[PDB]
């Protein structure tokens, strides 16, 4: 999840779009990766 943007579509549905080669695509942010891999365990990378 951290390096393979498999959570990209989720980002697009929530928001965080990015213009890649002239097309709207999902932007996988570290906040999304943290909220998806460890939803209830942590809230900030410092906490992790």
């Amino acid at each position: 999840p951290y390096i393979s943007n498999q959570y990209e579509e989720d980002a697009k549905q929530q928001g965080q779009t990015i213009n890649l080669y002239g097309k709207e695509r999902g932007l996988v942010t570290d906040e999304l990766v943290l909220k998806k891999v460890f939803d209830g365990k942590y809230k900030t990378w410092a906490e992790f």
Partner: protein, 48 residues
Amino acid sequence: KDPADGNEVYATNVVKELTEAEARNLNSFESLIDHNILSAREYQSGDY
């Protein structure tokens, strides 16, 4: 800014020498993690 994609959301890591005002505030071990400090023994002082 990157030549491939127009968006500037991509981040590049930069290592710099911390100021004295930040140095005195590093008393807590937790602060090392929070103030984002890394050892200089093997990492160069230039921007990556």
